[PDB]
PDB file of N, CA and C in Angstrom:
ATOM      1  N   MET B   1      37.500 -56.704-112.176  1.00 52.08           N
ATOM      2  CA  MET B   1      38.211 -55.609-111.480  1.00 52.08           C
ATOM      3  C   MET B   1      37.553 -55.308-110.144  1.00 52.08           C
ATOM      4  N   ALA B   2      38.236 -55.701-109.076  1.00 51.23           N
ATOM      5  CA  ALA B   2      37.772 -55.499-107.709  1.00 51.23           C
ATOM      6  C   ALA B   2      38.808 -56.038-106.733  1.00 51.23           C
ATOM      7  N   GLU B   3      39.906 -55.311-106.578  1.00 51.75           N
ATOM      8  CA  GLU B   3      41.003 -55.769-105.737  1.00 51.75           C
ATOM      9  C   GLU B   3      40.677 -55.636-104.257  1.00 51.75           C
ATOM     10  N   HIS B   4      40.646 -56.769-103.578  1.00 50.44           N
ATOM     11  CA  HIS B   4      40.539 -56.793-102.131  1.00 50.44           C
ATOM     12  C   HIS B   4      41.902 -57.141-101.550  1.00 50.44           C
ATOM     13  N   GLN B   5      42.570 -56.152-100.981  1.00 50.32           N
ATOM     14  CA  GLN B   5      43.938 -56.328-100.521  1.00 50.32           C
ATOM     15  C   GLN B   5      43.969 -56.695 -99.042  1.00 50.32           C
ATOM     16  N   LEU B   6      44.639 -57.797 -98.735  1.00 50.52           N
ATOM     17  CA  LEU B   6      44.823 -58.228 -97.360  1.00 50.52           C
ATOM     18  C   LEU B   6      46.288 -58.080 -96.971  1.00 50.52           C
ATOM     19  N   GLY B   7      46.538 -57.369 -95.883  1.00 50.84           N
ATOM     20  CA  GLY B   7      47.900 -57.129 -95.449  1.00 50.84           C
ATOM     21  C   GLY B   7      48.455 -58.266 -94.613  1.00 50.84           C
ATOM     22  N   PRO B   8      49.683 -58.111 -94.090  1.00 52.50           N
ATOM     23  CA  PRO B   8      50.345 -59.135 -93.281  1.00 52.50           C
ATOM     24  C   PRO B   8      49.696 -59.306 -91.911  1.00 52.50           C
ATOM     25  N   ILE B   9      48.760 -60.241 -91.824  1.00 54.80           N
ATOM     26  CA  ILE B   9      48.078 -60.536 -90.570  1.00 54.80           C
ATOM     27  C   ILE B   9      48.978 -61.361 -89.653  1.00 54.80           C
ATOM     28  N   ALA B  10      49.651 -62.343 -90.232  1.00 55.71           N
ATOM     29  CA  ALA B  10      50.553 -63.206 -89.486  1.00 55.71           C
ATOM     30  C   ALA B  10      51.675 -63.677 -90.393  1.00 55.71           C
ATOM     31  N   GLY B  11      52.645 -64.387 -89.835  1.00 51.41           N
ATOM     32  CA  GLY B  11      53.758 -64.875 -90.633  1.00 51.41           C
ATOM     33  C   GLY B  11      53.310 -65.808 -91.743  1.00 51.41           C
ATOM     34  N   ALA B  12      52.363 -66.681 -91.418  1.00 47.58           N
ATOM     35  CA  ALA B  12      51.867 -67.687 -92.358  1.00 47.58           C
ATOM     36  C   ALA B  12      51.227 -67.064 -93.601  1.00 47.58           C
ATOM     37  N   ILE B  13      50.605 -65.898 -93.440  1.00 47.14           N
ATOM     38  CA  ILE B  13      49.880 -65.261 -94.539  1.00 47.14           C
ATOM     39  C   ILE B  13      50.811 -64.918 -95.701  1.00 47.14           C
ATOM     40  N   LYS B  14      52.085 -64.711 -95.390  1.00 48.27           N
ATOM     41  CA  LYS B  14      53.065 -64.312 -96.390  1.00 48.27           C
ATOM     42  C   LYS B  14      53.233 -65.400 -97.452  1.00 48.27           C
ATOM     43  N   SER B  15      52.951 -66.642 -97.074  1.00 49.99           N
ATOM     44  CA  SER B  15      53.049 -67.763 -97.994  1.00 49.99           C
ATOM     45  C   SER B  15      52.036 -67.639 -99.131  1.00 49.99           C
ATOM     46  N   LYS B  16      50.780 -67.330 -98.795  1.00 54.01           N
ATOM     47  CA  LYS B  16      49.744 -67.169 -99.813  1.00 54.01           C
ATOM     48  C   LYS B  16      50.081 -65.999-100.737  1.00 54.01           C
ATOM     49  N   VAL B  17      50.774 -65.003-100.190  1.00 53.26           N
ATOM     50  CA  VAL B  17      51.155 -63.814-100.945  1.00 53.26           C
ATOM     51  C   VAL B  17      52.075 -64.175-102.114  1.00 53.26           C
ATOM     52  N   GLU B  18      52.878 -65.218-101.937  1.00 52.62           N
ATOM     53  CA  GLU B  18      53.733 -65.719-103.010  1.00 52.62           C
ATOM     54  C   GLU B  18      52.876 -66.203-104.186  1.00 52.62           C
ATOM     55  N   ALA B  19      51.802 -66.913-103.851  1.00 49.25           N
ATOM     56  CA  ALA B  19      50.867 -67.450-104.838  1.00 49.25           C
ATOM     57  C   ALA B  19      50.131 -66.341-105.589  1.00 49.25           C
ATOM     58  N   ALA B  20      50.081 -65.152-104.993  1.00 50.82           N
ATOM     59  CA  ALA B  20      49.327 -64.030-105.552  1.00 50.82           C
ATOM     60  C   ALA B  20      49.854 -63.602-106.919  1.00 50.82           C
ATOM     61  N   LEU B  21      51.097 -63.951-107.211  1.00 49.35           N
ATOM     62  CA  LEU B  21      51.698 -63.617-108.500  1.00 49.35           C
ATOM     63  C   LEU B  21      51.206 -64.566-109.593  1.00 49.35           C
ATOM     64  N   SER B  22      50.464 -65.581-109.193  1.00 49.15           N
ATOM     65  CA  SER B  22      49.914 -66.544-110.130  1.00 49.15           C
ATOM     66  C   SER B  22      48.397 -66.381-110.215  1.00 49.15           C
ATOM     67  N   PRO B  23      47.795 -66.670-111.380  1.00 47.25           N
ATOM     68  CA  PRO B  23      46.340 -66.628-111.542  1.00 47.25           C
ATOM     69  C   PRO B  23      45.652 -67.725-110.732  1.00 47.25           C
ATOM     70  N   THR B  24      45.027 -67.335-109.630  1.00 45.62           N
ATOM     71  CA  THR B  24      44.406 -68.290-108.734  1.00 45.62           C
ATOM     72  C   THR B  24      43.561 -67.567-107.685  1.00 45.62           C
ATOM     73  N   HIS B  25      42.984 -68.332-106.776  1.00 41.49           N
ATOM     74  CA  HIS B  25      42.206 -67.787-105.674  1.00 41.49           C
ATOM     75  C   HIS B  25      42.720 -68.381-104.370  1.00 41.49           C
ATOM     76  N   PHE B  26      43.104 -67.528-103.434  1.00 42.98           N
ATOM     77  CA  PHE B  26      43.719 -67.991-102.201  1.00 42.98           C
ATOM     78  C   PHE B  26      42.978 -67.478-100.973  1.00 42.98           C
ATOM     79  N   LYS B  27      42.473 -68.412-100.188  1.00 42.03           N
ATOM     80  CA  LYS B  27      41.806 -68.102 -98.940  1.00 42.03           C
ATOM     81  C   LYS B  27      42.667 -68.566 -97.773  1.00 42.03           C
ATOM     82  N   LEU B  28      43.141 -67.620 -96.985  1.00 40.48           N
ATOM     83  CA  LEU B  28      43.920 -67.935 -95.802  1.00 40.48           C
ATOM     84  C   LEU B  28      43.323 -67.238 -94.595  1.00 40.48           C
ATOM     85  N   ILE B  29      42.920 -68.014 -93.606  1.00 39.44           N
ATOM     86  CA  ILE B  29      42.448 -67.453 -92.356  1.00 39.44           C
ATOM     87  C   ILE B  29      43.282 -67.982 -91.199  1.00 39.44           C
ATOM     88  N   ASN B  30      43.859 -67.068 -90.448  1.00 41.00           N
ATOM     89  CA  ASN B  30      44.678 -67.423 -89.305  1.00 41.00           C
ATOM     90  C   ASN B  30      44.163 -66.728 -88.060  1.00 41.00           C
ATOM     91  N   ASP B  31      43.626 -67.514 -87.144  1.00 44.44           N
ATOM     92  CA  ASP B  31      43.085 -66.984 -85.910  1.00 44.44           C
ATOM     93  C   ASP B  31      44.133 -67.034 -84.817  1.00 44.44           C
ATOM     94  N   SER B  32      44.641 -68.243 -84.583  1.00 44.25           N
ATOM     95  CA  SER B  32      45.617 -68.500 -83.533  1.00 44.25           C
ATOM     96  C   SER B  32      45.093 -68.073 -82.157  1.00 44.25           C
ATOM     97  N   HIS B  33      45.963 -68.109 -81.164  1.00 45.05           N
ATOM     98  CA  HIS B  33      45.595 -67.744 -79.807  1.00 45.05           C
ATOM     99  C   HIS B  33      46.854 -67.616 -78.966  1.00 45.05           C
ATOM    100  N   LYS B  34      47.155 -66.397 -78.557  1.00 42.72           N
ATOM    101  CA  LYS B  34      48.348 -66.123 -77.776  1.00 42.72           C
ATOM    102  C   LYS B  34      48.192 -66.671 -76.366  1.00 42.72           C
ATOM    103  N   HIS B  35      49.304 -67.031 -75.750  1.00 41.89           N
ATOM    104  CA  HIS B  35      49.281 -67.562 -74.399  1.00 41.89           C
ATOM    105  C   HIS B  35      49.635 -66.449 -73.424  1.00 41.89           C
ATOM    106  N   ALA B  36      48.844 -66.304 -72.375  1.00 42.75           N
ATOM    107  CA  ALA B  36      49.076 -65.254 -71.398  1.00 42.75           C
ATOM    108  C   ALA B  36      50.152 -65.667 -70.404  1.00 42.75           C
ATOM    109  N   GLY B  37      51.286 -64.976 -70.454  1.00 40.97           N
ATOM    110  CA  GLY B  37      52.389 -65.284 -69.564  1.00 40.97           C
ATOM    111  C   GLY B  37      52.095 -64.929 -68.120  1.00 40.97           C
ATOM    112  N   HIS B  38      51.019 -64.181 -67.904  1.00 40.78           N
ATOM    113  CA  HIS B  38      50.584 -63.824 -66.559  1.00 40.78           C
ATOM    114  C   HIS B  38      50.084 -65.065 -65.825  1.00 40.78           C
ATOM    115  N   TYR B  39      49.365 -65.916 -66.559  1.00 39.44           N
ATOM    116  CA  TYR B  39      48.886 -67.197 -66.047  1.00 39.44           C
ATOM    117  C   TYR B  39      47.846 -67.044 -64.939  1.00 39.44           C
ATOM    118  N   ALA B  40      46.589 -67.138 -65.330  1.00 38.53           N
ATOM    119  CA  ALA B  40      45.503 -67.352 -64.388  1.00 38.53           C
ATOM    120  C   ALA B  40      44.892 -68.713 -64.691  1.00 38.53           C
ATOM    121  N   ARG B  41      44.204 -68.773 -65.818  1.00 41.83           N
ATOM    122  CA  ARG B  41      43.824 -70.025 -66.447  1.00 41.83           C
ATOM    123  C   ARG B  41      43.498 -69.726 -67.901  1.00 41.83           C
ATOM    124  N   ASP B  42      44.523 -69.260 -68.591  1.00 39.55           N
ATOM    125  CA  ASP B  42      44.400 -68.734 -69.941  1.00 39.55           C
ATOM    126  C   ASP B  42      45.403 -69.400 -70.875  1.00 39.55           C
ATOM    127  N   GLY B  43      46.654 -69.472 -70.431  1.00 39.50           N
ATOM    128  CA  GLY B  43      47.681 -70.172 -71.183  1.00 39.50           C
ATOM    129  C   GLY B  43      47.425 -71.666 -71.264  1.00 39.50           C
ATOM    130  N   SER B  44      46.431 -72.135 -70.516  1.00 40.63           N
ATOM    131  CA  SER B  44      46.053 -73.541 -70.522  1.00 40.63           C
ATOM    132  C   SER B  44      45.147 -73.855 -71.718  1.00 40.63           C
ATOM    133  N   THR B  45      45.019 -72.894 -72.631  1.00 36.52           N
ATOM    134  CA  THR B  45      44.230 -73.078 -73.841  1.00 36.52           C
ATOM    135  C   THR B  45      44.769 -74.260 -74.658  1.00 36.52           C
ATOM    136  N   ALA B  46      43.920 -75.262 -74.864  1.00 36.89           N
ATOM    137  CA  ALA B  46      44.333 -76.479 -75.549  1.00 36.89           C
ATOM    138  C   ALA B  46      43.148 -77.206 -76.181  1.00 36.89           C
ATOM    139  N   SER B  47      41.977 -76.586 -76.163  1.00 38.93           N
ATOM    140  CA  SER B  47      40.794 -77.208 -76.732  1.00 38.93           C
ATOM    141  C   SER B  47      40.792 -77.058 -78.252  1.00 38.93           C
ATOM    142  N   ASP B  48      41.227 -78.102 -78.940  1.00 39.88           N
ATOM    143  CA  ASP B  48      41.225 -78.114 -80.393  1.00 39.88           C
ATOM    144  C   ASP B  48      40.780 -79.471 -80.912  1.00 39.88           C
ATOM    145  N   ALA B  49      41.630 -80.485 -80.704  1.00 41.55           N
ATOM    146  CA  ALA B  49      41.439 -81.827 -81.268  1.00 41.55           C
ATOM    147  C   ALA B  49      41.525 -81.788 -82.795  1.00 41.55           C
ATOM    148  N   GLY B  50      40.564 -81.118 -83.412  1.00 43.45           N
ATOM    149  CA  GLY B  50      40.566 -80.924 -84.845  1.00 43.45           C
ATOM    150  C   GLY B  50      39.743 -79.712 -85.217  1.00 43.45           C
ATOM    151  N   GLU B  51      39.822 -78.691 -84.369  1.00 43.47           N
ATOM    152  CA  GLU B  51      38.985 -77.506 -84.505  1.00 43.47           C
ATOM    153  C   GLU B  51      39.581 -76.536 -85.518  1.00 43.47           C
ATOM    154  N   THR B  52      40.908 -76.410 -85.480  1.00 47.33           N
ATOM    155  CA  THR B  52      41.696 -75.653 -86.462  1.00 47.33           C
ATOM    156  C   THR B  52      41.387 -74.151 -86.461  1.00 47.33           C
ATOM    157  N   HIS B  53      42.404 -73.352 -86.164  1.00 44.73           N
ATOM    158  CA  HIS B  53      42.269 -71.900 -86.213  1.00 44.73           C
ATOM    159  C   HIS B  53      43.042 -71.339 -87.397  1.00 44.73           C
ATOM    160  N   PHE B  54      43.521 -72.232 -88.249  1.00 46.41           N
ATOM    161  CA  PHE B  54      44.184 -71.851 -89.482  1.00 46.41           C
ATOM    162  C   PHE B  54      43.817 -72.840 -90.580  1.00 46.41           C
ATOM    163  N   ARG B  55      43.498 -72.324 -91.752  1.00 45.97           N
ATOM    164  CA  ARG B  55      43.275 -73.166 -92.913  1.00 45.97           C
ATOM    165  C   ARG B  55      43.680 -72.431 -94.179  1.00 45.97           C
ATOM    166  N   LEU B  56      44.355 -73.144 -95.064  1.00 46.96           N
ATOM    167  CA  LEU B  56      44.805 -72.581 -96.322  1.00 46.96           C
ATOM    168  C   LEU B  56      44.084 -73.273 -97.473  1.00 46.96           C
ATOM    169  N   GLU B  57      43.319 -72.500 -98.226  1.00 45.35           N
ATOM    170  CA  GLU B  57      42.582 -73.024 -99.361  1.00 45.35           C
ATOM    171  C   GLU B  57      42.915 -72.232-100.618  1.00 45.35           C
ATOM    172  N   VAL B  58      43.484 -72.904-101.605  1.00 45.10           N
ATOM    173  CA  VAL B  58      43.831 -72.256-102.865  1.00 45.10           C
ATOM    174  C   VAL B  58      43.150 -72.957-104.044  1.00 45.10           C
ATOM    175  N   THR B  59      42.443 -72.161-104.833  1.00 47.56           N
ATOM    176  CA  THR B  59      41.579 -72.637-105.889  1.00 47.56           C
ATOM    177  C   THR B  59      42.038 -72.115-107.249  1.00 47.56           C
ATOM    178  N   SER B  60      42.469 -73.015-108.108  1.00 48.98           N
ATOM    179  CA  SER B  60      42.808 -72.668-109.472  1.00 48.98           C
ATOM    180  C   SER B  60      41.895 -73.433-110.423  1.00 48.98           C
ATOM    181  N   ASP B  61      41.014 -72.696-111.106  1.00 44.47           N
ATOM    182  CA  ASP B  61      40.035 -73.269-112.043  1.00 44.47           C
ATOM    183  C   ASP B  61      38.886 -73.955-111.301  1.00 44.47           C
ATOM    184  N   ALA B  62      39.149 -74.372-110.057  1.00 48.26           N
ATOM    185  CA  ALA B  62      38.153 -75.028-109.204  1.00 48.26           C
ATOM    186  C   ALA B  62      37.793 -76.410-109.738  1.00 48.26           C
ATOM    187  N   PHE B  63      38.815 -77.174-110.093  1.00 46.90           N
ATOM    188  CA  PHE B  63      38.630 -78.526-110.585  1.00 46.90           C
ATOM    189  C   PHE B  63      39.844 -79.359-110.213  1.00 46.90           C
ATOM    190  N   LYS B  64      39.747 -80.034-109.079  1.00 44.38           N
ATOM    191  CA  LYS B  64      40.860 -80.797-108.539  1.00 44.38           C
ATOM    192  C   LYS B  64      41.268 -81.939-109.462  1.00 44.38           C
ATOM    193  N   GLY B  65      42.544 -81.957-109.813  1.00 44.46           N
ATOM    194  CA  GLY B  65      43.077 -83.014-110.647  1.00 44.46           C
ATOM    195  C   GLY B  65      44.440 -83.471-110.176  1.00 44.46           C
ATOM    196  N   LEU B  66      45.300 -82.513-109.863  1.00 48.06           N
ATOM    197  CA  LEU B  66      46.633 -82.818-109.364  1.00 48.06           C
ATOM    198  C   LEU B  66      46.612 -83.066-107.858  1.00 48.06           C
ATOM    199  N   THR B  67      47.645 -83.727-107.359  1.00 45.58           N
ATOM    200  CA  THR B  67      47.772 -83.976-105.936  1.00 45.58           C
ATOM    201  C   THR B  67      47.869 -82.663-105.160  1.00 45.58           C
ATOM    202  N   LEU B  68      47.040 -82.526-104.133  1.00 44.04           N
ATOM    203  CA  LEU B  68      46.955 -81.280-103.379  1.00 44.04           C
ATOM    204  C   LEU B  68      48.275 -80.948-102.677  1.00 44.04           C
ATOM    205  N   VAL B  69      49.075 -81.967-102.402  1.00 41.56           N
ATOM    206  CA  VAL B  69      50.367 -81.769-101.752  1.00 41.56           C
ATOM    207  C   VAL B  69      51.342 -81.038-102.674  1.00 41.56           C
ATOM    208  N   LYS B  70      51.089 -81.118-103.976  1.00 41.09           N
ATOM    209  CA  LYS B  70      51.958 -80.518-104.981  1.00 41.09           C
ATOM    210  C   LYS B  70      52.021 -78.999-104.808  1.00 41.09           C
ATOM    211  N   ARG B  71      50.860 -78.365-104.693  1.00 39.76           N
ATOM    212  CA  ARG B  71      50.806 -76.915-104.528  1.00 39.76           C
ATOM    213  C   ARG B  71      51.191 -76.484-103.114  1.00 39.76           C
ATOM    214  N   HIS B  72      51.024 -77.377-102.144  1.00 40.06           N
ATOM    215  CA  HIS B  72      51.300 -77.040-100.747  1.00 40.06           C
ATOM    216  C   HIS B  72      52.790 -76.834-100.511  1.00 40.06           C
ATOM    217  N   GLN B  73      53.607 -77.547-101.276  1.00 39.39           N
ATOM    218  CA  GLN B  73      55.058 -77.430-101.173  1.00 39.39           C
ATOM    219  C   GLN B  73      55.512 -76.033-101.594  1.00 39.39           C
ATOM    220  N   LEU B  74      54.782 -75.451-102.542  1.00 41.84           N
ATOM    221  CA  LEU B  74      55.129 -74.151-103.112  1.00 41.84           C
ATOM    222  C   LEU B  74      55.091 -73.040-102.061  1.00 41.84           C
ATOM    223  N   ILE B  75      54.174 -73.159-101.109  1.00 43.65           N
ATOM    224  CA  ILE B  75      53.951 -72.097-100.133  1.00 43.65           C
ATOM    225  C   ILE B  75      54.601 -72.400 -98.783  1.00 43.65           C
ATOM    226  N   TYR B  76      54.754 -73.697 -98.472  1.00 42.39           N
ATOM    227  CA  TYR B  76      55.342 -74.173 -97.201  1.00 42.39           C
ATOM    228  C   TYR B  76      54.864 -73.362 -95.986  1.00 42.39           C
ATOM    229  N   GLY B  77      53.602 -72.941 -96.016  1.00 39.44           N
ATOM    230  CA  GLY B  77      53.087 -72.054 -94.986  1.00 39.44           C
ATOM    231  C   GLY B  77      52.292 -72.767 -93.911  1.00 39.44           C
ATOM    232  N   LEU B  78      52.199 -74.081 -94.014  1.00 39.87           N
ATOM    233  CA  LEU B  78      51.345 -74.855 -93.122  1.00 39.87           C
ATOM    234  C   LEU B  78      52.099 -75.296 -91.875  1.00 39.87           C
ATOM    235  N   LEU B  79      51.398 -75.279 -90.742  1.00 40.73           N
ATOM    236  CA  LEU B  79      51.914 -75.794 -89.473  1.00 40.73           C
ATOM    237  C   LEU B  79      53.120 -74.990 -88.985  1.00 40.73           C
ATOM    238  N   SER B  80      52.860 -73.766 -88.556  1.00 43.15           N
ATOM    239  CA  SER B  80      53.899 -72.902 -88.019  1.00 43.15           C
ATOM    240  C   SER B  80      53.305 -71.927 -87.001  1.00 43.15           C
ATOM    241  N   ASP B  81      52.413 -71.061 -87.474  1.00 45.18           N
ATOM    242  CA  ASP B  81      51.815 -70.026 -86.629  1.00 45.18           C
ATOM    243  C   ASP B  81      50.706 -70.613 -85.757  1.00 45.18           C
ATOM    244  N   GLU B  82      49.924 -71.508 -86.345  1.00 45.85           N
ATOM    245  CA  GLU B  82      48.820 -72.156 -85.657  1.00 45.85           C
ATOM    246  C   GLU B  82      49.343 -73.082 -84.564  1.00 45.85           C
ATOM    247  N   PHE B  83      50.512 -73.665 -84.806  1.00 44.35           N
ATOM    248  CA  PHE B  83      51.150 -74.541 -83.831  1.00 44.35           C
ATOM    249  C   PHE B  83      51.656 -73.717 -82.652  1.00 44.35           C
ATOM    250  N   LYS B  84      52.072 -72.492 -82.951  1.00 50.14           N
ATOM    251  CA  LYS B  84      52.459 -71.527 -81.930  1.00 50.14           C
ATOM    252  C   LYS B  84      51.257 -71.185 -81.049  1.00 50.14           C
ATOM    253  N   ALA B  85      50.080 -71.177 -81.664  1.00 53.58           N
ATOM    254  CA  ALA B  85      48.836 -70.934 -80.952  1.00 53.58           C
ATOM    255  C   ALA B  85      48.470 -72.139 -80.093  1.00 53.58           C
ATOM    256  N   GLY B  86      48.820 -73.322 -80.581  1.00 50.95           N
ATOM    257  CA  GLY B  86      48.500 -74.546 -79.880  1.00 50.95           C
ATOM    258  C   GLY B  86      47.330 -75.275 -80.512  1.00 50.95           C
ATOM    259  N   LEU B  87      46.861 -74.764 -81.645  1.00 51.52           N
ATOM    260  CA  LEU B  87      45.756 -75.383 -82.363  1.00 51.52           C
ATOM    261  C   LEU B  87      46.284 -76.128 -83.580  1.00 51.52           C
ATOM    262  N   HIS B  88      45.400 -76.813 -84.286  1.00 53.98           N
ATOM    263  CA  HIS B  88      45.793 -77.516 -85.499  1.00 53.98           C
ATOM    264  C   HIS B  88      45.325 -76.754 -86.730  1.00 53.98           C
ATOM    265  N   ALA B  89      45.639 -77.288 -87.900  1.00 51.85           N
ATOM    266  CA  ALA B  89      45.290 -76.644 -89.154  1.00 51.85           C
ATOM    267  C   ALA B  89      44.992 -77.685 -90.222  1.00 51.85           C
ATOM    268  N   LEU B  90      44.307 -77.263 -91.271  1.00 52.10           N
ATOM    269  CA  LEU B  90      44.022 -78.131 -92.402  1.00 52.10           C
ATOM    270  C   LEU B  90      44.194 -77.347 -93.698  1.00 52.10           C
ATOM    271  N   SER B  91      44.810 -77.966 -94.687  1.00 51.62           N
ATOM    272  CA  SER B  91      45.072 -77.294 -95.942  1.00 51.62           C
ATOM    273  C   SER B  91      44.563 -78.111 -97.120  1.00 51.62           C
ATOM    274  N   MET B  92      43.727 -77.497 -97.936  1.00 55.44           N
ATOM    275  CA  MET B  92      43.237 -78.137 -99.142  1.00 55.44           C
ATOM    276  C   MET B  92      43.371 -77.195-100.328  1.00 55.44           C
ATOM    277  N   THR B  93      43.831 -77.725-101.440  1.00 56.69           N
ATOM    278  CA  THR B  93      43.960 -76.938-102.645  1.00 56.69           C
ATOM    279  C   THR B  93      43.266 -77.632-103.799  1.00 56.69           C
ATOM    280  N   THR B  94      42.591 -76.850-104.610  1.00 55.97           N
ATOM    281  CA  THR B  94      42.007 -77.347-105.829  1.00 55.97           C
ATOM    282  C   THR B  94      42.649 -76.641-107.017  1.00 55.97           C
ATOM    283  N   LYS B  95      43.192 -77.445-107.924  1.00 53.64           N
ATOM    284  CA  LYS B  95      43.864 -76.959-109.118  1.00 53.64           C
ATOM    285  C   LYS B  95      43.664 -77.989-110.224  1.00 53.64           C
ATOM    286  N   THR B  96      43.421 -77.514-111.442  1.00 56.47           N
ATOM    287  CA  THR B  96      43.272 -78.385-112.600  1.00 56.47           C
ATOM    288  C   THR B  96      44.462 -79.330-112.742  1.00 56.47           C
ATOM    289  N   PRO B  97      44.231 -80.527-113.304  1.00 58.68           N
ATOM    290  CA  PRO B  97      45.282 -81.527-113.504  1.00 58.68           C
ATOM    291  C   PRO B  97      46.541 -80.939-114.131  1.00 58.68           C
ATOM    292  N   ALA B  98      47.691 -81.373-113.639  1.00 61.84           N
ATOM    293  CA  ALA B  98      48.966 -80.906-114.159  1.00 61.84           C
ATOM    294  C   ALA B  98      49.313 -81.669-115.425  1.00 61.84           C
ATOM    295  N   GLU B  99      48.491 -82.660-115.720  1.00 63.29           N
ATOM    296  CA  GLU B  99      48.614 -83.429-116.938  1.00 63.29           C
ATOM    297  C   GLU B  99      47.591 -82.941-117.958  1.00 63.29           C
ATOM    298  N   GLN B 100      48.018 -82.019-118.801  1.00 64.63           N
ATOM    299  CA  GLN B 100      47.144 -81.417-119.793  1.00 64.63           C
ATOM    300  C   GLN B 100      47.739 -81.571-121.188  1.00 64.63           C
TER     301      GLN B 100
END
C-alpha cells in the first residue's frame, strides 16, 4: 500500500494508464522538446541519434518470456509525442511467458 499517482503529463502517458488496470509495473518518462516558432537557433533542435527523450518500460513479474512486441501492441503509445519533439524513443517490456 503506497499509491504514487502520476497525472496526464503528455498524450503518450495515457497509454500506460490503460495498463494500470492490470497487475504490473509501468515506467513511462516523456521529456520531449517543443520547437520555438520565434526561431533564433532553438527550433533547430535535432541532437538525438539514439538519445531518446521517451521510453516505455513495463514489468510484469520481472521475468521476460513472451515477445516484448506483444505487450507493446496493447498500449500503442510508442513513437508519437517524442517524434513531435524530434527525438527518438525505445520501448522494452518484461512479462512472464504467455505459455504457462
